[PDB]
Structure formats: C-alpha cells, structure tokens
Amino acid sequence: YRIEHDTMGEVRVPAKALWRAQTQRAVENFPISGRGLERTQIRALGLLKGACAQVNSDLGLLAPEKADAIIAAAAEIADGQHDDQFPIDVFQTGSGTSSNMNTNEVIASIAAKGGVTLHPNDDVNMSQSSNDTFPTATHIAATEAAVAHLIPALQQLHDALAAKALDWHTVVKSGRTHLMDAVPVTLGQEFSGYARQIEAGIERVRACLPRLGELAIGGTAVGTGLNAPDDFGVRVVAVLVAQTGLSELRTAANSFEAQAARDGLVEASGALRTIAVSLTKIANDIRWMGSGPLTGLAEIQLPDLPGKVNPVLPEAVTQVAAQVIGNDAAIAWGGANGAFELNVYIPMMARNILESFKLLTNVSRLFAQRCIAGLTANVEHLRRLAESSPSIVTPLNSAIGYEEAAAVAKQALKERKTIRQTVIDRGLIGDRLSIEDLDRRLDVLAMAKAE
Amino acid sequence: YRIEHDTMGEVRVPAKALWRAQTQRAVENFPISGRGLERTQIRALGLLKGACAQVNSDLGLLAPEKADAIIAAAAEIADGQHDDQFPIDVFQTGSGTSSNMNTNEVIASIAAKGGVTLHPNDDVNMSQSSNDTFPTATHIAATEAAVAHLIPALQQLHDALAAKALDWHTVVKSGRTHLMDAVPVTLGQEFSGYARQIEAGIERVRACLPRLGELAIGGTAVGTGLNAPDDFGVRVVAVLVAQTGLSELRTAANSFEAQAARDGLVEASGALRTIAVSLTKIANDIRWMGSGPLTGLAEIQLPDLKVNPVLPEAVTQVAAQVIGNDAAIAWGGANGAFELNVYIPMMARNILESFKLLTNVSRLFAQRCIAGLTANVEHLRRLAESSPSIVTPLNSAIGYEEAAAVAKQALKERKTIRQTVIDRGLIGDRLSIEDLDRRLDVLAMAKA
Amino acid sequence: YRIEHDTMGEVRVPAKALWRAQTQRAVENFPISGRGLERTQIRALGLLKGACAQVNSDLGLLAPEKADAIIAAAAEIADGQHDDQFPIDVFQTGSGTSSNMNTNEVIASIAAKGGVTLHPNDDVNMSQSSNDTFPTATHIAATEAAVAHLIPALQQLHDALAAKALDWHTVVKSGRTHLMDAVPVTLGQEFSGYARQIEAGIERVRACLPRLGELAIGGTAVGTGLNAPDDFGVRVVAVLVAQTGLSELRTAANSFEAQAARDGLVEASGALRTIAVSLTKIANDIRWMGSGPLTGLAEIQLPDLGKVNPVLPEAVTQVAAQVIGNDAAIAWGGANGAFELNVYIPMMARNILESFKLLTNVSRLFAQRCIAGLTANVEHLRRLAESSPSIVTPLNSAIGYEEAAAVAKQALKERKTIRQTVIDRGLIGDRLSIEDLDRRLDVLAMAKAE
Amino acid sequence: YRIEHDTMGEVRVPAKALWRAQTQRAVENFPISGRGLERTQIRALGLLKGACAQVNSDLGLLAPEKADAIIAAAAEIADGQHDDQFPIDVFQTGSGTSSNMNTNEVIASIAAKGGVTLHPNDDVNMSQSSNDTFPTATHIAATEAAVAHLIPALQQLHDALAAKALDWHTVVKSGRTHLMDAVPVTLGQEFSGYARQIEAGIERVRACLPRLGELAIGGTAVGTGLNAPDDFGVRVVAVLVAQTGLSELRTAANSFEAQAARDGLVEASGALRTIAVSLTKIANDIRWMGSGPLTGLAEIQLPDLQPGSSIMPGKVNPVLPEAVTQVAAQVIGNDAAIAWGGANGAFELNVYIPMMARNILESFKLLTNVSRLFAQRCIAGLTANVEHLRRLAESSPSIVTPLNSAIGYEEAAAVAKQALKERKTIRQTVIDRGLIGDRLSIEDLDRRLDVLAMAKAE
Numbered sequence A: 001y002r003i004e005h006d007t008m009g010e011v012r013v014p015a016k017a018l019w020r021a022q023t024q025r026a027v028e029n030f031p032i033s034g035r036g037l038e039r040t041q042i043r044a045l046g047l048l049k050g051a052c053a054q055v056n057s058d059l060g061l062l063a064p065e066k067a068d069a070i071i072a073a074a075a076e077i078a079d080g081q082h083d084d085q086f087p088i089d090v091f092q093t094g095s096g097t098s099s100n101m102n103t104n105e106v107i108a109s110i111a112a113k114g115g116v117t118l119h120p121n122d123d124v125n126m127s128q129s130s131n132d133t134f135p136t137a138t139h140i141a142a143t144e145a146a147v148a149h150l151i152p153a154l155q156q157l158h159d160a161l162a163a164k165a166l167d168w169h170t171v172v173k174s175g176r177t178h179l180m181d182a183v184p185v186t187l188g189q190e191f192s193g194y195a196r197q198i199e200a201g202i203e204r205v206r207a208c209l210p211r212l213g214e215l216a217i218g219g220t221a222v223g224t225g226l227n228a229p230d231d232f233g234v235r236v237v238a239v240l241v242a243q244t245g246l247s248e249l250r251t252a253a254n255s256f257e258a259q260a261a262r263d264g265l266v267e268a269s270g271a272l273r274t275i276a277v278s279l280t281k282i283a284n285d286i287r288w289m290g291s292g293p294l295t296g297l298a299e300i301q302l303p304d305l306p307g308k309v310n311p312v313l314p315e316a317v318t319q320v321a322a323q324v325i326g327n328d329a330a331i332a333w334g335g336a337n338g339a340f341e342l343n344v345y346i347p348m349m350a351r352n353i354l355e356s357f358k359l360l361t362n363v364s365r366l367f368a369q370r371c372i373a374g375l376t377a378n379v380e381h382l383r384r385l386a387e388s389s390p391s392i393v394t395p396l397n398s399a400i401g402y403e404e405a406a407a408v409a410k411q412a413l414k415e416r417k418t419i420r421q422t423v424i425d426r427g428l429i430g431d432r433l434s435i436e437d438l439d440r441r442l443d444v445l446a447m448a449k450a451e
Numbered sequence B: 001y002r003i004e005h006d007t008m009g010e011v012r013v014p015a016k017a018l019w020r021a022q023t024q025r026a027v028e029n030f031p032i033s034g035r036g037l038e039r040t041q042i043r044a045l046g047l048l049k050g051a052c053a054q055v056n057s058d059l060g061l062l063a064p065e066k067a068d069a070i071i072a073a074a075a076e077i078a079d080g081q082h083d084d085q086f087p088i089d090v091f092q093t094g095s096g097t098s099s100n101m102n103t104n105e106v107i108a109s110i111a112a113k114g115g116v117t118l119h120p121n122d123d124v125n126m127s128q129s130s131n132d133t134f135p136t137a138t139h140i141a142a143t144e145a146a147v148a149h150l151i152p153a154l155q156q157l158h159d160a161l162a163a164k165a166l167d168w169h170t171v172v173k174s175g176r177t178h179l180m181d182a183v184p185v186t187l188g189q190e191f192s193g194y195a196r197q198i199e200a201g202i203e204r205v206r207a208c209l210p211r212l213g214e215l216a217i218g219g220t221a222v223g224t225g226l227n228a229p230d231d232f233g234v235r236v237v238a239v240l241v242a243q244t245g246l247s248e249l250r251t252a253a254n255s256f257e258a259q260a261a262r263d264g265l266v267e268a269s270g271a272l273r274t275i276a277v278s279l280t281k282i283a284n285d286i287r288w289m290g291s292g293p294l295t296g297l298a299e300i301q302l303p304d305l306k307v308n309p310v311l312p313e314a315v316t317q318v319a320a321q322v323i324g325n326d327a328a329i330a331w332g333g334a335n336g337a338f339e340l341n342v343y344i345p346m347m348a349r350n351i352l353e354s355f356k357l358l359t360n361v362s363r364l365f366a367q368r369c370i371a372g373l374t375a376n377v378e379h380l381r382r383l384a385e386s387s388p389s390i391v392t393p394l395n396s397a398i399g400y401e402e403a404a405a406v407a408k409q410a411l412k413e414r415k416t417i418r419q420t421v422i423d424r425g426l427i428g429d430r431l432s433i434e435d436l437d438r439r440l441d442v443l444a445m446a447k448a
Numbered sequence C: 001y002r003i004e005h006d007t008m009g010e011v012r013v014p015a016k017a018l019w020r021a022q023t024q025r026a027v028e029n030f031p032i033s034g035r036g037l038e039r040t041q042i043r044a045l046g047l048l049k050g051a052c053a054q055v056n057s058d059l060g061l062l063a064p065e066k067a068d069a070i071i072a073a074a075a076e077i078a079d080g081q082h083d084d085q086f087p088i089d090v091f092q093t094g095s096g097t098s099s100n101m102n103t104n105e106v107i108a109s110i111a112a113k114g115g116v117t118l119h120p121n122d123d124v125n126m127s128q129s130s131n132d133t134f135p136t137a138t139h140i141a142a143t144e145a146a147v148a149h150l151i152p153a154l155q156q157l158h159d160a161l162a163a164k165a166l167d168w169h170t171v172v173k174s175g176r177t178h179l180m181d182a183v184p185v186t187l188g189q190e191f192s193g194y195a196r197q198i199e200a201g202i203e204r205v206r207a208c209l210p211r212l213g214e215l216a217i218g219g220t221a222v223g224t225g226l227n228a229p230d231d232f233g234v235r236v237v238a239v240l241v242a243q244t245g246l247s248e249l250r251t252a253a254n255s256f257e258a259q260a261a262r263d264g265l266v267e268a269s270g271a272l273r274t275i276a277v278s279l280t281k282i283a284n285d286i287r288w289m290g291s292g293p294l295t296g297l298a299e300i301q302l303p304d305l306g307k308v309n310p311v312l313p314e315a316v317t318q319v320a321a322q323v324i325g326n327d328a329a330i331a332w333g334g335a336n337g338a339f340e341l342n343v344y345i346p347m348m349a350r351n352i353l354e355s356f357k358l359l360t361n362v363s364r365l366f367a368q369r370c371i372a373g374l375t376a377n378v379e380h381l382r383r384l385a386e387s388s389p390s391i392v393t394p395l396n397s398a399i400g401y402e403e404a405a406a407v408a409k410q411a412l413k414e415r416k417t418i419r420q421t422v423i424d425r426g427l428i429g430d431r432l433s434i435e436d437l438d439r440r441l442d443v444l445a446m447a448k449a450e
Numbered sequence D: 001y002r003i004e005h006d007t008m009g010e011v012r013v014p015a016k017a018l019w020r021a022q023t024q025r026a027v028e029n030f031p032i033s034g035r036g037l038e039r040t041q042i043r044a045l046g047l048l049k050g051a052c053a054q055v056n057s058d059l060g061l062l063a064p065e066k067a068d069a070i071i072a073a074a075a076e077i078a079d080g081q082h083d084d085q086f087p088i089d090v091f092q093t094g095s096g097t098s099s100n101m102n103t104n105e106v107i108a109s110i111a112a113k114g115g116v117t118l119h120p121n122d123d124v125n126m127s128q129s130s131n132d133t134f135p136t137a138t139h140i141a142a143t144e145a146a147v148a149h150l151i152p153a154l155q156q157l158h159d160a161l162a163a164k165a166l167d168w169h170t171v172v173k174s175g176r177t178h179l180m181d182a183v184p185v186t187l188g189q190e191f192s193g194y195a196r197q198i199e200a201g202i203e204r205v206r207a208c209l210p211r212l213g214e215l216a217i218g219g220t221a222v223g224t225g226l227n228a229p230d231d232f233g234v235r236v237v238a239v240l241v242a243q244t245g246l247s248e249l250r251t252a253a254n255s256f257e258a259q260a261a262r263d264g265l266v267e268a269s270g271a272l273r274t275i276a277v278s279l280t281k282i283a284n285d286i287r288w289m290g291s292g293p294l295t296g297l298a299e300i301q302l303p304d305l306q307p308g309s310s311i312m313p314g315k316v317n318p319v320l321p322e323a324v325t326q327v328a329a330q331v332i333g334n335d336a337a338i339a340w341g342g343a344n345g346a347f348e349l350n351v352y353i354p355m356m357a358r359n360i361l362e363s364f365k366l367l368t369n370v371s372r373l374f375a376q377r378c379i380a381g382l383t384a385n386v387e388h389l390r391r392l393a394e395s396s397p398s399i400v401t402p403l404n405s406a407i408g409y410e411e412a413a414a415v416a417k418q419a420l421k422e423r424k425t426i427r428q429t430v431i432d433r434g435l436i437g438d439r440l441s442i443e444d445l446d447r448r449l450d451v452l453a454m455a456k457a458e
C-alpha cells in the first residue's frame, strides 16, 4: 500500500491502484451493493472529462500539455482500458461526487505514467463541479442508450413482428375477448397490433429525447455557473455532439432545473415502463398461443431453445418487464426527493434507468431473432376451429332464425363439426338458404375483413 | 319501484330511474366500491352515442326520427343532466360493456318521454360493439381532461412561478446542496427552476396527445370492424372533433392495438407521474422555505388559509395518489389478452382521477399559495452573507499563487476568505477594501 | 343557506348542515377530489369522540351533562346517521385536523338541538390535539376493517375454495408448467393450493394486527401527552375495547413513533397487496380454465351473471390492480413524515380503507357467485390426461424410451389415449399385459391424491 | 477452451470452467443483464444438493461413494469456493431450471477431478425436478439472509439509536409539526421513536418467517411428489435444519401453493419495504437535524466521512443518510418487481423465480449492509448542539400555555408576541412586563417555564 492525502488527512491506498485517496475513502465508506459503475457510465465520464479539457484548452484556461494528457487518458477510459479502476459502490454520496473524483484521480495517474503532473481537482476538474458532472455523464449515457441501442433494437423487433403480420395475413383464427371465443381475426392482424405497440414504443422514446438529452455541464455547484466560463456548457455540448454524433445532446433549458431535479430520467423511465407493459402483452399472448401440445391452445409452435418447447424467451421478456417496472418505481422515488439546489439520488437513478435501457435493448433483439422470426402457425388447425365456432352462426340468423342458429351452434360443438357441415346435416339447405348463400355468410376470412 | 322483464326473470327498478333491466342486473352483480362513473366519463359516453347516431343517420342505416331522439337524449347526458342515472360500480365487466348498456338504456328511456321507441342495442348501439365503445369514451374523457383542463391549470401555475422568478431576481440567499451551506443563489433563480419543471410538465402532456387521443370506435368486437361501416370510425371522430373542438381526437393507427391494449393511458399516466414528481420537489422546497418561524429556515411567509403549509401538504398528498394510481394503470395495461384489454373501467377511474387531482390542486397552489408568498429579504441576505465564499474573484488582484494561499489558510484556520485576506495584510494598492467587497459581493457571486 | 361569523369574517353554511365555520372554510380551501371521508373513518371519529368524552367525564374534567350530550351525538355518528355531514375533501391538511374539527362541530350542532351547549374545541376536543385524533380514528377504522370484515370475507372464500378442493378430489387432469402439458394433478389439488393462498392471506392480516391496532390517542400535539391526563390513552383505549369488543386496539408502544410515522398502515397495506397478488393468480387460473367453449382450455364452466364471460374474475383482477396502486400511494406517504408528525394521514387513510373494502366485498362475491357454482368437465379432463405425451414415462421400463416416444407421437396425431395407442401398435403381450398397462397409465394414481 | 457434445450438437466451454454443455447453452441463450446468481443463491444451491444426496443415500437410492462425492462437492459450493462457476444470466427460464442444471454440472465436474463419475441429472438431480429445486434454494437463501444477517444488523442499528435516546434523555428542544414550531420534546424522545421504528422492523421480519421458510422440496414437477419418496421433503428439511441451525426452514403447508406461487417472497418484500419507509424517515430527519452549519437547523453534527467539495473546500455532507435513502428507493423498486412476478404465476408453476430471487436477496443485502454502516459510521458518533436546542425551546411562544392560570391567556399571548418580536426568552419577556409579584414568584415562573418538564420525559 501507499500513502495518499486529501483536505481531511492521510489514507492508505492499494500500492498498484490508479485511483487515489478520495476514491479509497469511498471504497471504505460505501461497502453496500458490491457493484460499481457500468461500462456505459465509465465511458460517459471519460467522454465528459475529455470534452471539458478540450474547452478549457480552447479558452486558454488550461496549458496545452495538461489538456493533451487529460484528453489521451480520458480516451483510454472511454475505450474501456481502466474499468477495474472504478471500485466505488453505486450507493455513494447522492451527487455522484465520489465517482467524479474517481475519474479525476485515475486520469491524473494515467497522465503521471506519461510524465505529466495533473492535479485531479485544479486541472482535471477545472471549470467543473461534482454537482454538474455526474448528472451530465448520466444523461450522456441514457441518451446514447436510447438513440444508439434501444431504438435500433425496438426497430428490429418491430420489423420481425410486421414480417409475421404480412406472412400470416390470411391465417384466419378465432378471436378471443375475455378469453372467450369471438368472431374471426387473422394471426396477421394480431401481429400487426403487436408491431404497432413496438412502433408506438419507439415514438415514446423519441418524444422524451428533447429533455433526456439536456446536460447540466456549466452550472457548477448550484446552477449559477460560478467558477466556470459563461459559455462552458454550450462549448462542452458542441464537443460532445461532434465526438459522439448524438445531436440529441443539448445544454439545459434552465441550469437550476437541471441540477435540482432529474425529471428527464423520470420521464424517460415512463417510456421504458410503457414498452415493458407492451412487451408483457406481446410475450403473454405468444406463450399462450404456443401452449400445449395437447391441452393448450396450440395455435403456434415456438422455436426450440416441436410443440413441446418451453416458452423461455417469453419468460425472459416478462421477467425483464417486471424488472423495468421495479426500476421505474425506484427512479420516480429518487426523482421526487431533491432539495433546494441538488437532487442527491443520482447514482441510484442512474443505475436503474441504464439497467432498464440495457435489459430492454438485449431482450428485444433476442425475442426478435430467436422467438418471433422462427414462429410457425398451425394454419389448417386454426381455420378448422374458426369454421367450427358458435361465434360465426350470427350471420345465419336472418335465414334460419335465432332458435335454429342456436341449435346449429350446440350440435356443431357437441359433434366437433364445422358450422357449414352442421347446417347441411340439419337439412337447412334449400328451405332457408342455398349453398352459395351459406358459403358467403360463413366465409371466415371475409368475416375477419382480410383478403 | 316498477318491475321489468329480463330473459332470466323479473327485475325491480327504482321508478325515477331511466336505466332498465341490464343496468339493474349490473347494480346487483357488482356491489364492490359503491362508486360509479364520474361526470367526465358520463359526458364522454353521451358525446359518443350522439356522434354514432349522427353517422348512422348520414349513412341511411338509422331512420332520422330515431337518430334525432338519440342525438337529443345524448346532448342532455353530455350536458350533465343525467349524472344520477349511471349507478354501476367502477369494478364491473372489464370491457365496460355494463356502462355501455347503461348509456343505451338511459337514452331509450329519455326518447320514450318524447314519444319515440328506441331499442337500446339495435338502435342506440347500432354499428358499435360491447368492446370499442367504453375505451373510446375513456380516451375522449382523458383527451378533454388533458387539453381543456390540465394544460391550462399547469400554465396558470407556471405563470405564478415565473412571476416570482422575476420579482425575486435579485433576492440573494444561500444555496443549499445536500442540505448544507453552499454558494449564493437568488430566490428568483430557484423559482425559475420550479417554473421550468412545470413548463416541461406541459411539454410532457403535449408529447402524449398523438396516442392519448386515438379512439377505437369502428373496430367493433375484435378490432376487424365487422358489422360496422368501413368508414364508421373516421366519420364518428370527425363529428366528435366538430362538437368538442378537440382536434387531438383521431382514429386509431391500428384498430387491433387500440382494443388489445390501453398503452395510451399508461403513457399518459407516466406524464402525470412525472408532474407529481416535479410538484413534490416544488411543494417540499416551499414548505421548508416557510418553516419555523424560530426552529426553521424562515425564508418566506406562506399565505394563511404560525401558518401551517396546508397547500404544500395537499400538493404532496395529491402527488402520492397520482403515483399509486399510475401503478394501478400500468398493472391493468400489461394484463390484456388477445383481442381485448379487460381492465378498462379501473384504468379509466385511475387516469381520470389523476387528471382531476393535478388540475384542481395546481390551480389552488398557484392562486392561494404561490401568488401570495412573501420573501424575508433581509433574513435571506444575512444567510447569503453566511455562505461559503471562493478566492477566484481575487485572482486579478493578488494572483493565482496568493489566492491559493488565502484558500488554504481560510480552510486550515476555519476563517472566511474576507477575514483571511485582511489577516494576511493584503489590503494595499493591489486591493482596497472597496475592491475586496465588490469582488466577493454575494449578489455578484449568484451571477443573476 | 344560513350564515355564520368566524375569527376571519362571514361564512355561508347550508341550512341542513350540522357542520360550522371551520368545516365550511375547509370546503372552500380544498376543492380537489370531490370525495370526502368514507363511512368507516366517520364511524371511527364518532367512536373516538364518545370514548374521549367518557374518559374526560370519568376523570372529572368535563361536566356530565356535556359528556352525555357528546356520547349521544358521537353514537349517532358511529351508527352512520350523519355520513352526509362530512363534506371535507380527503386532500386536506395532512394531520387530518380539518376532519377532526368537522367531527367536533357536527357533535356540537347535534347537542344544540337537544338543548345542550358544547364548545367544539374546549368540550368536544378536550384533552385531545389536532394531531393524535385523526390517526387514532384511522387505526380504529383499519383494525375494525381487518377483524370484523376482511378476515370473515377471506374465511368465506377459503371455505368455498376448500369445498371445491374436496368435491374435485378425484377430478384428474393434465398439469401445466410454463403453460405446457405436464404430469397429472387433480382439480382438487389445484383448489387446495388456492385455499392455502387465502388461509395464508388471513395469517398475514392476523400477523400485522399487533401494530395496526396501536392508537396515538393521549400523545397530544407532539407525542409527549402535554395538556392531556397522564393515563388518557390507556383509559380511552379501555373504553373503546369495552364498547367495540375489538381487543386488538392498544396504546402505542412508543408515543413518538405513533405520531411521527404511520408504519402500521404501510405494514397492513403490504398484507393486502400480498392478498391481491394471490387473488390475481387464483382469478387468472379460473378464467383460463373457463376459456372456450371451443378454442380455449374448456376445463370448467363458470356460472352465468360455457359461453359466460368471466366477469367476477375480471372484477377480482381489477380490484387487485387498485390494491397494488393504493399500496404504492400508502408507502409514499408513509416514508415522507418529518420530525414529530407524518402529514400524509388523510391520503393514507383513504387508500388503506378502500383496499380493505374492495378486498372484503369482492372476496365475498367471488366465493358466492363464482367459486361455489363452478362445474368441471370431468370426463373431458380425464380423456386429455389419459392422452398426454407427458404420461408415457412409466412405459419406458417395459417398452423402452424410443417406443414410448413413438406411442406419444401417434397418440397426439391420431387424437387417441396412450392406452389405445399402445394396444393399436400391437405392444400387448409378455412384455406388457393389459393389467400392467392400466397400472402404468393410472393417471389418478400419478396425481398421488389422498 | 475445450469442446463438448450436447444432444443438439458441439459446444465450446472455457478451459477452467466446471460447468458443462447445458450451462454453456444457457450462457449463449440469455445474454441479457450480464449479471448471474449472487453468493447467497449459489451457497443455497450447494446446501440443497448436499442435503438431497444425503437423503437419497439414507433411503438406499444412491450409491454411497456417489453421495459422498456430491456431499463433498456441494460443501465446496456452499463454502463459496466456486462462485465463478455460475455464469447464467438472472433473466433465464423462469423456473430457474438453467441454474439448477449449472449446479448439477459443476458438482459432476468437481467429483470427476476425484475419480468419481456422477450423471448431473440421474445422480445429482435424483428425486428432484427442474421446478422444486430453485425455489427451495431461493427460500433457503432468503431465510438465511433474514435470520443470520438482516435481523442482527437491524438490532445493531436499534441499539445505536436506543443508546442515543438514553444519552439525550435531557436534551430539550422545540418539537416540529408540519415543519412549524411546536411544544417541547427531547432529542432522546425523537431517537426513542426511531429505535421503536427499527424494533418494529425486526418484529415485521420475524412475523414473515413462518411462510418465508416454507420449502417446495419433494414436490417435484407439479407439486404431487411424483418420482420422489413420499417423505423426501421432511427428510431434506431435517438435514438442512440440523446442518445450518435455521429453525425457520419447514416443508410447505401445501405442496401446490409452494410451486404455483411465491407469495412468501411477496410477503417478505413487504416487510423490507416497510423497513425502507422507516429508514427514509429516520435518515431524512437526521440529515435535516445536521443541516447547515449556518443556513440550516444545526441541531446535531454528523461525523465527517469524506471531503464534500473542491469549490467549497471545508463543506462536509450527510453521505450516510444519502446512502440509506438511496437504498430505501432501491428496496421500494425491488418490491414492485417482486409483487409483479408474484402475481403472474399460471397453474402449477410461477415462472418469475430468478427475477423475484434477484430482487428479494438484493433488498436483504442492501438493508443489512447500509443498516450496519448507518449504526457504526453515523449514529454512534452524532453529537447534539445542546445549548442551541435549549435556547430555542426557552424562546418559544409554544411554552406560554402554563402561565395562563397565573396571568391569563390574553397576557400570555402578549408575552409570546413580544418575546418573538424582541428575540428574548419567554422568562425574560415575563420579567420585562413587571408580572412577577402577587400571582407569580420568580421560582413559580421557573417552575411553569421548565421546558424539560414540559417535554414530560419519563
């Protein structure tokens, strides 16, 4: 071990570690979850520290040699070379200051190897505060997870569901309302519904981006921008947009709102919770569709991970959905409980919203590729049940009367025959209606209003 | 106390009641909460039945005498004249079919008083099903609640907060982070943050309207539109837009999504939940600011309705209720099956209550709390003059090196920057007292 | 439209209103939800005011003619005769002081009609504060809801489920795991599981009562009992226990915890949330088992209120959703007390008391109008159990797993019993008698019932 | 690397991996969270497989050399020696069958290193199924977390709060109701309330154990017990209780309820949710009482744990109350996830077990760890600003009430008005208005205005 110090005194630190005294104190203060920042969060802190040093350099506030060493070290952090040098618990000081110091200290150590002396706070934290940096890194990570990862994953799941809507356009089957047999639909129409739920999910994510992409950087300790250049925020955002290509990143509309609250994470988590609600309905219908092979609905077969496969992907999707709903409740709880100039629930809110992004992204692509794409429909079976359902007797009423339509439905169900065969077996053809009229009235695909 | 004849026997119905047998059976079946539809929901059911009758008349499917009687009876319901004719529990069949039939029966009874005979099903429910009517009325009610009521109430609260942000632009005070003394801010800056939260709230509600305003009407039993005209939905929506002025009402993008799911309600509830989260921070800050007057922060004085912060308490309690309602909505939203989500009456109760609570408490908070707040200006300046200071504004006078030495000695000896500058003998040609006091001025440090 | 003169001006009060100026101001201050206190919280406020007057009379603090007038007026409130005299919104001052004052004013107005003058504060609120009364009434109402109403309702549902478990003891059917076919169970075994869920629900409600029944009365403004007799709490609780028979009512273990927090309501709501979770599983299984009549599971028929919509399972799952939401609102209020007082009490009381009422009413309806009248498709369920690929495993030691897999495939394709398939494939002989086959494919024995 | 053969083809497995083909398929099937089972779940799966092998040996179903090898391998897993051999995602098949097979495969691989051949299914999974094992291990883990870790941690916090309540028995201060000035209390009374919240928290955990400790073992695939000995569950429970000392473990009252539902986890989460609600109140009150030191309430001082800021060099922050309130938020979210999973079983199996297990065991761990840290690094070192607190109590308008019977409520109200206006003590204001004489001696004033007696401390 080695001796390091801070404004509170002296601290023993692992002789080898890139982090310094403040990080070590936080390792000792917060042994709670045993989990630290995720790859996406460390990448965002690296991007931000690089962009700050670039702007400080551009404003002649920081020596070029120091800015260059920060930019190079921060690039190594953003690329993933130093993940082991972020040991601090998620459950740390609410502003995320410990993690901010962790980035500063690691950057200084990297620079030192390369012969450059950086002061973690006077150089690596120049023009910044703990209060504006950690939420900025959080909103970069959440915006990147929304734009670069979740939206493309939902688009892949949308396309797989729309492809089934088209493939199954004429696959007529029983409708089901209240779980009870209803007038006909097609599997295609039901999948067009699932596709619309996912398309609307993408619209929900896009609608939250004008506020999710807002960054606190430049507001310093309390939102006033004291101890930063007046244009720090607009300059740093311009660097982050050019480096990431995320045009959704923007300076906060109000510098006080951006630090006193995290309402943009609450808003975004509501979009994710809505997707989790949509995915629950889609996955539940699909596993019920596959149920059997004998005693269930046996409408479709899920691909094996023939008719006896456990619906394991639907199970993963509905478990992810449960986790997103829980995470959402934790996010709203932290969101509400800010005071005055700072919301001090940022590390916990960050853990939860980034996890929700990751789970939905990963499960959506698996569901699309390994469940949706390989579903096969029991087409003739579905049509035979639709043609045999008491639900389709209604259009006979005007030809044969209510009482006889009811007797047809009862006999068809008891004898396990089609409506068409029962109407013939009861001797109703000629008297009340012709074969041509019967085939028009009982055409189940026409009844589903599909072609 | 009259008796009626249902195809499972004899049903006694109160004599002044306009509902008939199906509604009276639903009253007997669902004695669960003892609360029925709200007036917003009754109004929306009246609007939908008048619009359907109009379109069935325009298409020649319904005789103009019957259409006229349905339209007149529907206008009375939409006008609030029959809010006592809807006795069915919220906790009813999950399609809302019972309340749909309640509307059909009341219109039939209103029509019969003017000498016209209507069949509740064949005439008043023509081209509609048991499953596309109650979700349509729910979305009409929620869209009206968002556009005509909530957004203007939030704008009133925004304008009250923004007016204080301007009044108090130079009312300097101490910042607080982690509840600890921080560098100066103004009371106006804090109120500018509150105003932005409510402005972002209005943006959040606006953002959900393209989906909240989607109506299922025309989809009939399963979403296929069987037994409705092909253009029923588009024609009914046009009548509803014309009659209500709500341009946000639209036909569903997908007629299956619009009946299998209520995801539009779940989305909208998320916006309301975010507003509840914002209101909690605003209300909490305001009651803390008003706390004391000896044991608290005593920064502001709330209007009296030793003043208890009763409107901040009402706001925070409303916020709690919107959070619970939101959880119930998401639970019902997720539990659809195949062609129908059967949680509609519960989801409707919860999202329409959330709209109403937020509307009503926002206007009360704006008018009877925010507008009348008074700042304790001299107290707030004394707190600002006790905040930590920084040496940065001395750099141009004593240089980076001396400024850094001032900062170190101030921390070590637990002194202010100001006293440390004086104690180090730094007052001279490089730095007058005037210049020290101008550089460290607390309102300049708030950068207003 | 009669008129009243306040400490702050004039107030118009409805003529047939028994409330006075403080209530009317609260009506004007809080037009938020349009919903006031429930019948159970009005009753509890009457109970509490009667017992407080009894004790103030017993200690010689209150003239007995005034105490008698309060006791008579409070009894009318407790008996539900004045449910229309409580117009204040739920969303009021967070201590429930407005509703406290509403009760004091209504009692004074009832007393006035019988010739007795009571000061709402000095007489009806004697020894009490604005902060220990409303939460005491909340905990009386919630404890009475748990003990007199919800437990007996849950016991009625338990007994209905258990009676089905016994009637269907030998009704063999396919198990289902992951929604896929599995080895046999009986409908009786499944209903015995539902019954245990409800019996465990009753255990969960019983387990929260030591803390749900804790009353703050006597703690006055901050929990110290300043301006009350030292034994006010134990005296008032003893009168409430004697009058109501509710032995679960008790003084708070800690008078500060009883006012700074409402953790007993949060605890109780968790038990109600667990019951809602159990009822969701039971109601969902029942509506799935009734699905059809052609394209669903068609295991049972629900009674009308095999084409019946499952309307009571829909009522039960909707109520369960409301209980879950209410539970989230209660926890939110519970967490956000400050120092000597939690000021979310009216919101918490609304939510907890609604949850109790919905679960009570829907459990009785579910037991009586759904569970009691279910009918099983007994022969059909046995035919599917006897035709399932899941039951060929006990053939392996006779014919090997490869021929057992061939039997399973042919039984499913030809829609025949495993028994008939084994006979049709010519496997009856020295390796397998008809009697040994019938032992190996005895699906009811595979379910291992009593 | 090193190659293997499934029934569905050839699988490559890391070289130092003790898992086999089924585990490697699950790794490829569920790349969702990148997080697998925690230490406590792995331990429980080890305990369970050892107890099962012991019972199968006792009943003469499993050869003793095979049982001894499973027992030895399972003890290594339960001792935390193999925490890196469970790579499967939490978000797996909802019965937890993947993690069950992972345990069977790791045990077979440990035994093979000692020259004994075990079939992961026919030996290590003997008398068990893919559905009654993972929920049994979940309930063992949750019961152990409640009894061995959380209750002791909560007791430590209770004792720290109760010690402050006693040290501060006479530390008089103004009450606060609605955040407004109220009549006197002691800091000791407030801390006795916080102590009771934590003690009630322990009572809530104890009250759930009769159902949390119920185990599905012996139920097999659908709860019937088919393909297992009639008494397998009571025999496995007897072994677990004897080896662990966990008296709360029991065989389920109903074998169907035990597999079709996880209501015991929903119930236990409710107790943890209530503790999070109590901890929120305690931690919020403490950081408010520590607020300032110049612009806040400055009632107490929290022990300094790390530098608060670089811009404000000497500012120190209530970091432990922030950790506690963040944990509480996580426990409330976790609780919502668990209830959601608990409600959505179907027929003979609830298929939300891995997700419900992750959330319930995380809530136990966060609450245990943060409770100990709050007790040792915050509560134990709090110091009260006694003279500040007494000065405010002695200047409070709220304390004029006991003057009423001497000078009347109108004159008492004038004393309060004046004191508050002129920033004086009530005692001094009563003097500066000449009221000491006939109706009121100087010692009679000091008896009426005794702020500690007004707090009515036992």
Ligand SMILES: COc1ccc(S(=O)(=O)N2CCc3ccccc3CC2)cc1NC(=O)Cc1n[nH]c(=O)c2ccccc12
Residues within 6 Å of the ligand: A294, A295, A296, A297, A413, A414, A415, A416, C293, C294, C296, C297, C298, C299, C377, C380, C383, C384, C387, C415
């Ligand atoms: C999950 O639903 C099923 C699963 C499998 C099969 S099956 O292909 O394996 N099948 C062959 C057909 C048959 C012929 C004669 C006797 C019995 C059977 C039943 C077995 C059918 C079904 N549904 C039905 O039999 C539907 C049904 N129709 N008519 C009714 O009167 C009736 C009464 C009660 C419940 C359901 C029914």
Ligand SMILES: COc1ccc(S(=O)(=O)N2CCc3ccccc3CC2)cc1NC(=O)Cc1n[nH]c(=O)c2ccccc12
Residues within 6 Å of the ligand: A293, A294, A296, A297, A298, A299, A378, A381, A384, A385, A388, A416, C294, C295, C296, C297, C412, C413, C414, C415
């Ligand atoms: C809800 O499940 C059902 C509902 C109704 C009925 S029914 O009684 O109305 N019925 C009579 C039997 C029959 C005879 C010949 C051809 C078709 C049919 C089906 C119609 C059966 C079923 N289930 C099945 O047919 C089950 C089944 N068995 N064998 C399979 O190979 C198969 C393949 C795909 C899907 C399911 C199956």
Ligand SMILES: [Mg+2]
Residues within 6 Å of the ligand: B294, B295, B296, D296, D297
């Ligand atoms: Mg003070």
